[PDB]
Amino acid sequence: IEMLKTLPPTLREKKRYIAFKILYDEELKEGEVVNLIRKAVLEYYGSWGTSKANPWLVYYDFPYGILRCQRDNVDYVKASLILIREFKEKPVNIICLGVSGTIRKAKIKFLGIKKPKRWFVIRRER
Amino acid sequence: RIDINRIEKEEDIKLLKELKWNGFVFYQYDDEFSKDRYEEVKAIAESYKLKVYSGVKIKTESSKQLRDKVKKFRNKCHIILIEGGVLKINRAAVELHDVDILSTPELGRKDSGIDHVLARLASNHRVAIELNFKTLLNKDGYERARTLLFFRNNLKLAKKFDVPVVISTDAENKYQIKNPYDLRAFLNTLVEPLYAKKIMETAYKICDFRDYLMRDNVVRYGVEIIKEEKE
Amino acid sequence: RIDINRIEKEEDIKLLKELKWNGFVFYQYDDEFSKDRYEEVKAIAESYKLKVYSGVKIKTESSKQLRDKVKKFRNKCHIILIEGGVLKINRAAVELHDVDILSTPELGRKDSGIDHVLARLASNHRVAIELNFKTLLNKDGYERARTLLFFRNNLKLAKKFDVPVVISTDAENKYQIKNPYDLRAFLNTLVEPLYAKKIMETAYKICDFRDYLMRDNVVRYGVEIIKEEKE
RNA sequence: AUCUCCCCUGCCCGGGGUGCAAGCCGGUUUCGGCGCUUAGCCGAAUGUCACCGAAAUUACAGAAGGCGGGCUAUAGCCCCCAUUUU
RNA sequence: GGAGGGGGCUGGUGACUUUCCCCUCUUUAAGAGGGGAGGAAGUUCCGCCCACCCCAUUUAUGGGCAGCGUCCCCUGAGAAGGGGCG
RNA sequence: GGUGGGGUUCCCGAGCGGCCAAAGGGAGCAGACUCUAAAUCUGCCGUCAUCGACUUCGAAGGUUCGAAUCCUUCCCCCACCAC
RNA sequence: GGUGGGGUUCCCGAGCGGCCAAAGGGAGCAGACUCUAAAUCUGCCGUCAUCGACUUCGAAGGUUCGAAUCCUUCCCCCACCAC
């Protein structure tokens, strides 16, 4: 088996979760969102900043979305979100709602109302 | 928190109010302005819940005949903007000491934004520098590099001489507008967060001063109240 | 300043000596090593002005039968490297406490570089981590992002536990090699310049220790000099 | 040295077993609420800078119902003890 | 004066953001105020508050803890550390 | 956060405080066997590689006449838990 | 680093310490003129827009009965220089 232990929280990367929206009347696949956010995070950070602020999209079902960040550099990720201009025929709009430390709290502040827990049940049932 | 953009539809402005925005500026970049557009601005401002201050703008005309005609068209509206990469009109625009905010030193010039003598004259005449962002969203990579290099040079020349700075997106459509927290995080990314807050504070205070000037009988900051001897 | 690369021609190494480099390591990534290659290493090292230390390398074999055979082939050469993304062989490689430097946690794994238990066991057994750079020059953009994210994670896990780190380019051709000031400026760009100097100091001291160990009659750091009772 | 009894002294009386992911409620697979906080998360929040001071975010290192004892690893100053020394 | 061992302490004020969080509040929706990780949270060796299940309702019998400081033994540069109580 | 446990040869696994006592199995090498090979058996079995002797039972300290074992500490590896 | 100088109306340019003294030219507007237009002339010439009156001579302070002018300070604009 290939298993890696999670680092202790004094040594692990301090993270934040940015909740945002990709506003347009057009539609997107989540892989297109990952591709555009990788191109933009390169275009604003280089190798140095992308090693610095740790970008990874975690959720995109609706035009809303949730992405993970380092704690000291959420303003850098937001400035990376501003400089979207064009994707191959058209722009997309990226508009941030807020930022929190978890999904249950950022889900209820701007995104929705209830607090879901799906990772536990897909780990224990499957 | 005050934005500068043009009005196209009502749903866009209703989305603007629902986020953070308390007010903004309607942007007239033309030579044909009337009361019908300003009444439509009144209607869309009273549509949901807002207040909008309208301005006028000029580009590429004469040296100081333009200054007199700009004063004459400015006597009807609240605020004003003069844009142009020409240094010759820029000297007169910072010399006439009545323009509120100033834009476009980077795309019509492509050499450097503000001169040292220009920044010292702006300190004596108290004119503010307005930083646009639509220029960042219609360029290429090295063009973004040279443009943000010009903005960082102008940011230092405004920081050392205490020149007032107003950020805006200079938007044109429904989606060109961006968040105020985004612009604050970007100006935090550039140099400092306190100066980033000071830019928004100055952007509020300049419209507050123009409103308090053109609101009542105020001449060279003189307030006149009940039982006037006005002719 | 010690590099780790393979030898192809003499002009490349003559260019290496003319810049800054005082010595380097010849890299044998194969299972067929003889004395002819090492004599050619002697000839090219005595060609202009240099000293070269040769090593051997293994990849993708069994768990601890590989450990015994690796000790048996290591008893002929100076230093050694074991590369592999498998954690199962990595535990034995850091457990056997006789391997000098360790590489490849990032491209065979693509999940995370070093585990916390792995870093604590490396602290007890004193094995060093070698950071390659040819992996940076044969990937794409986000692959560079994930790889340097893994290197910054491993840099923290080596900084907090005082794990020795040796930088190298892991070169393969004439032009894959880079400057030592370049690698120092890059490790300065990542976290710190003092740790960047400490990496080069450790890279010199580990080869100095292996040379001082296999040079004379030294067993568990015991120096024996003139008029020996040696059988 | 180990194990079991009877010979003492003082104190205390419900005796065991599981443990908050215990246990209780709307629901009746699965979920939400109580336990739960002069910090109280749960896909695990407690952010950045400057400075008085010099005890300071620097080393070991992070809560998850709360309290008390013991063990392990060390950052800065203070106090105490020892070898070399003069 | 130099490697080392043991004991004590580990925060306060000011500025930014509710877009770091929670609570309270008024108000043309956003602001103001207060609070926000420690000697070990680690290790799980334990006990108590809190719950359920059985026997029993007993200081009659019986059960649990302790004999500390001191002393003894062992190893260290002989300060110090570990174990024990007739 | 919690309970019941395990770490011994290259891999799976036993082992009373005591003579490598270290059961072992599979593996490697060699012998034997066969036309060749499989299977069975024999010795080395980590080393010298004939008998025999020495080292390793996760690591350190301590008890003892003597530690895989008895005590303490440091670790890791399992199993299962949100409802 | 250095020398000789200049800043006055929308633009080129004069101006004794003194009555918008502010020469002016080009420009705008109006008149006159012409079938229309160019040219010439007339008034406003920055404002009230008939006479006439007020403001600005790069900015501040000071002298004076009174500053474009005289003094001081702060500036800018020219010209040319490495050999």
Swiss-Prot record, chain A:
Enzyme class at the top of the EC tree: hydrolase
Main location: cytoplasm
Molecular-function annotations in GO: ribonuclease P activity
BP-aspect Gene Ontology terms: tRNA 5'-leader removal
Gene3D superfamilies, alphabetized: Ribonuclease P, Pop5 subunit
UniProt keyword rRNA-binding present: no
Domain of life assignment: Archaea
Keyword vocabulary terms for this entry: Cytoplasm, Endonuclease, Hydrolase, Nuclease, tRNA processing
UniProt xrefs under Pfam families: RNase_P_Rpp14 (PF01900)
EC number(s) per entry: 3.1.26.5
InterPro entries: Pop5/Rpp14/Rnp2-like (IPR002759), Rnp2-like_sf (IPR038085), Rnp2_archaea (IPR016434)
Listed GO CC annotations: cytoplasm; ribonuclease P complex
Catalytic activity line of the entry: Endonucleolytic cleavage of RNA, removing 5'-extranucleotides from tRNA precursor
Cell location: Cytoplasm
HAMAP family linked: RNase_P_2 (MF_00755)
PANTHER family the record matches: RIBONUCLEASE P PROTEIN SUBUNIT P14 (PTHR15441), RIBONUCLEASE P_MRP PROTEIN SUBUNIT POP5 (PTHR15441:SF2)
Annotated family: Belongs to the eukaryotic/archaeal RNase P protein component 2 family.
Record's function text: Part of ribonuclease P, a protein complex that generates mature tRNA molecules by cleaving their 5'-ends.
Quaternary structure note: Consists of a catalytic RNA component and at least 4-5 protein subunits. Forms a subcomplex with Rnp3 which stimulates the catalytic RNA.
Name of this protein: Ribonuclease P protein component 2
Species, as recorded: Methanocaldococcus jannaschii (strain ATCC 43067 / DSM 2661 / JAL-1 / JCM 10045 / NBRC 100440)
UniProtKB/Swiss-Prot annotation, chains B, C:
Top enzyme category: hydrolase
GO cellular component: cytoplasm; ribonuclease P complex
Reactions catalysed, as given in the entry: Endonucleolytic cleavage of RNA, removing 5'-extranucleotides from tRNA precursor
EC number: 3.1.26.5
Any one Pfam family match given in the protein's UniProt record, by short name: RNase_P_p30
InterPro entries in the record: Pol/histidinol_Pase-like, RNase_P_comp-3_arc, RNase_P_p30
Domain of life according to the entry: Archaea
GO biological process terms on file: tRNA 5'-leader removal
Localization (cell): Cytoplasm
GO MF annotation terms: ribonuclease P activity
UniProt keyword list: Cytoplasm, Endonuclease, Hydrolase, Nuclease, tRNA processing
Stretches assigned to coiled coil: none
Homology family: Belongs to the eukaryotic/archaeal RNase P protein component 3 family.
Oligomeric form and interacting partners: Consists of a catalytic RNA component and at least 4-5 protein subunits. Forms a subcomplex with Rnp2 which stimulates the catalytic RNA.
Function: Part of ribonuclease P, a protein complex that generates mature tRNA molecules by cleaving their 5'-ends.
Name of the protein: Ribonuclease P protein component 3
Organism name: Methanocaldococcus jannaschii (strain ATCC 43067 / DSM 2661 / JAL-1 / JCM 10045 / NBRC 100440) (Methanococcus jannaschii)
Gene: rnp3
